[PDB]
Design a protein around this ligand. Structure first.
Ligand SMILES: [Mg+2]
Ligand SMILES: [Mg+2]
Ligand SMILES: [Mg+2]
Ligand SMILES: [Mg+2]
Length: 326
């Protein structure tokens, strides 16, 4: 019937912010993405009502105009890929992701579609400034994202629900959070040393914030996803199945895991090595950028209509979810 969300904002010690360029870059980005005909009229109606750019405002509130607009275009592009592939079988979703992937990776490749052209335009923005390290890893993130979205579609169409360990590997990639973290070096204007990405403390912070985003998105989006038969790619479903618990308990377990990840993130922050004044300053800005993503994703979730409907503002305070019919 109903359940209550875990109180994730109460567990978040970070102070959220928004981007002052939101009004102008969002109008530009929304006009850009809507210049393409790719979604059904019903999907369009929800898409243009989802406040996609507001998510970017909350999660990259420090971005300068140029970089912020690029992030808006990118998140709008991801939402397009997501909503198109949601309505597709496994082979069609794999082809959709491969349009994005080839357009990103191969400067010659353009199959003529609206999605290819959209990807090429974001790509040209990214490549104005992105460093060789950031871009090389971004393309690797692109391939992992596409493979995970395609496999999500295959498993959805077959009814297969992954075991929790396999689910987390897949969800980390098909949530696109690694792509979004992958723009930090672009937004901040500087590549991190490749050695930083295999520091054990930095890896701990990276994965704790990525998982916080994944698990909080899952418990928030569960209602809308189960109502459209999409609940297989969701930790709530995985927990009910494999731990044999009911919905409120799975919700409670999301909250316990979120608190564990947040504690690990905050306690790990202090153990960060020091490499040099300039590297340390850049690393610190990257770590603050993960904090803004964790906090901004939470805040946006209660500002958009995407997960909670038109009464989303009230749900922020009651956390009471009534399950939607099919
Ligand atoms: Mg989705
Ligand atoms: Mg996502
Ligand atoms: Mg979701
Ligand atoms: Mg999905």
């Amino acid at each position: 019937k109903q359940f209550t969300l875990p109180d994730l904002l109460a567990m978040c010690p970070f102070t959220g912010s928004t981007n002052p360029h939101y009004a102008k870059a969002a109008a530009e980005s929304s006009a850009w993405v809507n210049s393409y005909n790719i979604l059904s009229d019903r999907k369009r109606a929800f898409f243009v009502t989802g406040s996609n750019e507001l998510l970017v405002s909350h999660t990259y509130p420090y971005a300068g105009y140029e970089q912020f607009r690029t992030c808006c275009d990118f998140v709008n592009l991801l939402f397009v890929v997501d909503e198109v592939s949601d309505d597709q079988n496994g082979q069609d979703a794999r082809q959709t992701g491969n349009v994005y992937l080839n357009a990103m990776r191969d400067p010659a490749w353009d199959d003529g579609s609206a999605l290819a052209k959209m990807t090429k335009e974001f790509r040209a923005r990214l490549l104005r400034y992105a460093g060789p390290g950031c871009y090389r890893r971004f393309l690797k993130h692109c391939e992992d994202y596409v493979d995970a979205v395609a496999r999500e579609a295959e498993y959805r169409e077959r009814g297969y629900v992954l075991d929790m360990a396999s689910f987390e590997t897949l969800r980390r990639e098909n949530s696109a959070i690694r792509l979004c973290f992958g723009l930090f070096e672009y937004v901040l204007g500087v590549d991190l040393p490749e050695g930083v990405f295999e520091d054990p403390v930095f890896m701990t912070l990276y994965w704790a914030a990525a998982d916080m985003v994944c698990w909080s998105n899952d418990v928030y989006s569960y209602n809308m996803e189960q109502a459209k038969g999409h609940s297989g790619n969701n930790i709530v479903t995985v927990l009910m199945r494999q731990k044999n618990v009911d919905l409120q308990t799975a919700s409670d377990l999301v909250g316990e895991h979120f608190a564990t990840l947040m504690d690990r993130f905050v306690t790990a922050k202090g153990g960060l090595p020091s490499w040099s004044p300039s590297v340390d300053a850049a690393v610190s800005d990257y770590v603050r950028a993960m904090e803004y993503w964790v906090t901004g994703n939470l805040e946006w979730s209660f500002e958009t209509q995407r997960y909670f409907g038109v009464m989303h503002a009230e749900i922020k305070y009651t956390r009471l979810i009534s399950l939607r019919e099919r």
